[PDB]
């Protein structure tokens, strides 16, 4: 039976895919090209699931043949049914102020070895695991990191003995989801996973598939894009909605955000791939976008591509910056920013800075933020005149060697506001 547990001690907050990742999880026998594993292992830790010591040795030889950086490769020995690590591996959440935990669930497939796998993931990472008794799949889940999550309708229809209030309450208790947005899938295919048509790229940005006017799903996808563009996001502005045109069922929304890199599956034509990559680059300033060709033996599909066959792994020692930015026209008369910073590594934080620029003058300048109370840092912009333009971002570091900015990418994409008070 599924191992349901109590939920984590609160407050709880699900970690978004665009927050720091300490690794990426993949599985052998493989469903991804070796070129992707090589690109991943250049800068990130790759954890490969294998069934035995013998399969570990087989994978090390294949990685060596392909020129993969073995110093960034680790293994978990566990039986698995499939390579869809997106769908059956555990979900990450912060809880109890400064801890990172794993959330297990009932995988919505008759794949009992995949379903059992999250306990091995939590044991490898040395983190606690909580069992949320819902039939779920990670491909059908995404969070903004501020309490919202989007899922297709199967989150309710595959949990039909529970009311929507009961399903919503489990997402609140185990993942800190205060808005569980369960929508009718707009894609007209069997899988009903959000990652085949939608992807948060930041707390204020969402990518939505677009198809030609006469495609049968055209209006459902336009309605979905208009729904996000019409509502407020976690940063108080309306969502920025970006569109990836699939002229022929290319899975352009099925990308992986891993730290400052974005891996986008491409399967042509080349000009249409370039257009899709340039949407990601436009939406995500400062990120490095990589178009990834599929493996010939396990190609990318419209309903199953790169995001489906990977899962980011959160940092157990995450240096977490919580910030609601000051954006756009600001009435004033005060312009005060606040950021909460917590070290899940239990390391002393020093320094916490605001990097800023006024009216585009010179370079960004750092100012130390004031620690008002443990983990709560503030900064007031002084001497600002009407119509002054401010660019800023947050930086923090701790004694474990971690360094983080808010927004994630830092200086390439600062927050901006205009002073309106005289």
Q: Distance between CA atoms of 129 and 118, rounded to whole angstroms?
A: 8
User: Which residues does 77 contact at the CB level (< 8 Å), separation at least 6?
Assistant: 50, 51, 52, 53, 56, 120
Q: How far is CA 272 from the centre of its chain?
A: 25
Q: Distance between CA atoms of 284 and 206, rounded to whole angstroms?
A: 11
* Using rule CB under 5 A, residue 273 touches Na ion: no
Nearest 5°: the CA angle 30, 206, 284 is 80
The span of 141-149, 159-167, 311-319, 355-363 binding Cl ion (CB under 5 A) equals 159-167
**What SS3 state is found at 340?**
strand
Consecutive H or E run containing 257? strand 256-258
Give the shortest CB-145-to-Na ion separation in angstroms. Answer: 23
Catalytic status, residue 344? no
- Picked from ligand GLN, Cl ion, Na ion, none, the partner binding residue 121 (CB below 5 to 8 A depending on kind) is none
- Picked from Cl ion, Na ion, ligand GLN, none, the partner binding residue 143 (CB below 5 to 8 A depending on kind) is none
* Using rule CB under 6 A, residue 86 touches ligand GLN: yes
Give residue number: closest CB to ligand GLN.
Answer: 304
Among 327, 384, 332, 336, residue whose Cα is nearest residue 358: 384
- Picked from Cl ion, ligand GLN, Na ion, none, the partner binding residue 115 (CB below 5 to 8 A depending on kind) is Na ion
- Picked from Na ion, Cl ion, ligand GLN, none, the partner binding residue 139 (CB below 5 to 8 A depending on kind) is ligand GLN
Q: Residue 77 or 230: which CB sits closer to Na ion?
A: 77
Q: Distance between CA atoms of 43 and 326, rounded to whole angstroms?
A: 32
Q: For 232, which DSSP code?
A: B
* Using rule CB under 6 A, residue 304 touches ligand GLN: yes
User: Which residues does 226 contact at the CB level (< 8 Å), separation at least 6?
Assistant: none
Judged by CB under 6 A, the number of residues near ligand GLN is 10
Q: Distance between CA atoms of 46 and 157, rounded to whole angstroms?
A: 34
* Using rule CB under 6 A, residue 233 touches ligand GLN: no
* Using rule CB under 6 A, residue 109 touches ligand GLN: yes
Q: Residue 138 or 414: which CB sits closer to ligand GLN?
A: 138
Catalytic residue among 73, 196, 308, 419: 308
Active site residues: 308
Residues that bind Na ion (CB under 5 A): 104, 107, 115
Residues that bind ligand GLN (CB under 6 A): 84, 86-87, 109, 139, 191, 193, 303-304, 308
């Amino acid at each position: 039976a599924f191992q349901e547990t109590n939920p984590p001690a609160g407050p709880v907050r699900a970690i978004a895919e665009y927050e720091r990742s300490a690794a990426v999880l993949v599985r052998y026998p493989f469903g991804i090209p070796m070129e992707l594993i090589k690109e991943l292992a250049k800068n990130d830790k790759v954890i490969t699931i294998v069934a035995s010591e013998s399969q570990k040795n087989t994978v090390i030889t294949q990685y060596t043949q392909s020129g993969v950086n073995l110093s960034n490769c680790d293994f978990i020995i566990a039986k698995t049914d499939s390579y869809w690590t997106r769908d059956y591996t555990g979900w990450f959440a912060m809880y109890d102020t400064n801890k990172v935990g794993l959330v297990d669930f009932i995988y919505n497939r008759p794949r009992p070895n995949d379903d059992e796998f999250p306990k091995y993931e939590a044991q490898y990472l040395g983190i606690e695991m909580f069992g949320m008794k819902l039939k779920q799949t990670g491909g059908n889940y995404m969070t903004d990191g501020y309490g919202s999550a989007v899922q297709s309708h199967i989150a309710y229809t595959e949990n039909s003995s529970l009311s929507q209030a009961q399903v919503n309450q489990k997402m609140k208790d185990y993942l800190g989801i205060t808005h569980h947005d369960v929508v009718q899938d707009p894609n007209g295919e069997y899988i009903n996973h959000v990652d085949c048509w939608g992807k948060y790229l930041a707390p204020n940005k969402i990518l939505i598939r677009k198809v030609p006017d006469n495609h049968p799903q055209h209006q459902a996808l336009e309605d979905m894009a208009a729904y996000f563009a019409a509502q407020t996001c976690a940063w108080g502005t309306k969502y920025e909605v970006y569109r990836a045109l699939a002229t022929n069922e290319q899975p352009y929304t099925n990308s992986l955000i891993l730290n400052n890199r974005v891996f986008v599956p491409v399967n042509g034509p080349a000009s249409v791939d370039n257009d899709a990559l340039n949407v990601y680059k436009t939406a995500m300033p400062g990120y490095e976008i990589i178009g990834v060709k599929g493996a010939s033996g396990t190609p990318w599909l419209g309903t199953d591509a790169l995001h489906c066959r990977t899962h980011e792994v959160a940092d157990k020692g995450y240096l977490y910056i919580k910030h609601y930015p000051i954006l756009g026209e600001q009435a004033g008369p005060d312009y005060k920013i606040e950021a909460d910073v917590v070290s899940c590594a239990n390391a002393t934080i020093s320094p916490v800075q605001c990097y800023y620029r006024i009216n585009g003058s010179g370079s960004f300048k750092a100012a130390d933020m004031t620690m008002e109370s443990t983990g709560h840092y503030t900064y007031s912009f002084t001497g600002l005149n009407k119509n002054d333009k401010v660019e800023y971002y947050i930086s923090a570091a701790d004694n474990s060697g971690r360094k983080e900015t808010y927004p994630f990418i830092g200086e390439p994409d600062p927050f901006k506001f205009t002073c309106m008070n005289e």
